[PDB]
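User: I'm putting together notes for a lab meeting next week and I want to include a structural view of one of the chains we've been expressing. I don't have a solved structure, so I'd like a prediction I can at least talk through. The sequence is below, exactly as it appears in our construct file.
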Amino acid sequence: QFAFVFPGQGSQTVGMLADMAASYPIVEETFAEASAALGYDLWALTQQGPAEELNKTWQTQPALLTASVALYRVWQQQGGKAPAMMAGHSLGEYSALVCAGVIDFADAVRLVEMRGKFMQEAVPEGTGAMAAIIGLDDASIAKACEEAAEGQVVSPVNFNSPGQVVIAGHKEAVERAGAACKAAGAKRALPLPVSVPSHCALMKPAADKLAVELAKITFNAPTVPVVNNVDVKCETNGDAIRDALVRQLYNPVQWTKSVEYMAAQGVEHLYEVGPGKVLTGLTKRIVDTLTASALNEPSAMAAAL
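Assistant: Thanks for the context. Below is the predicted structure for the 305-residue chain, given as structure tokens.
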């Protein structure tokens, strides 16, 4: 069995999917549909940038969602078979819900532009921070964060693989936690170029605004199970999925456990349906019994069909 996994923020690069668009007309057709919903040319933004425009999060999230749905449509159009299940990393969870038939594509494009705007405005610029902690187990990272919090917020927010955890919170608490993790044996504490402290308690005001928007959208039952990030559960009910997306914004992304759950269900290969190869590289570190590959080059797509 194989599963489809969808990347989030961090995987975009200006010029992404240029070769796929050249072989498959449906890629630019999917972007034209998203441009009509947004009021600007989203394909031109992904191909020309500049990179700081593509990295503004209310523009990055529609761009990545549309890039993933375009690749899924190539697979479907070419007669590819249904994956056993789907999962996506943070923004990628929205790409999975569109491909599984839960949210209409144009509704989702507008919704993730709004998710980026609410995220951007949740906390004043220079208040928050994010950092990757390399080579330390999860329990020790959680302990280092607890000691460093000192009346602020700093939490492990992305469990990406054993030995790769991203932490986020107030800027100063993140610096203290990084130091404490280094002292406890962490190989590296790399500050990330993001000031939005995603997936921790400081995002709760943005989650409250997102909940209001999610309620206005029709949710349909998924045609393929989607393992969500916050609970590592497959839900079918519209309100349960809406609730999981609201809580997703201020709670950790459980990526390690999602991949472990797919392997326990019998999945043996993961295809990454989006730009880059970030989730492909993490797979073997979680369970090296799993294989993984990315479907973003025409050669790989042809080899996979």
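A couple of points you could mention at the meeting. The chain has two domains: 123-195, 1-122+196-305. Residues 57-77 form the longest helix (21 residues).

User: Perfect, that's what I needed.
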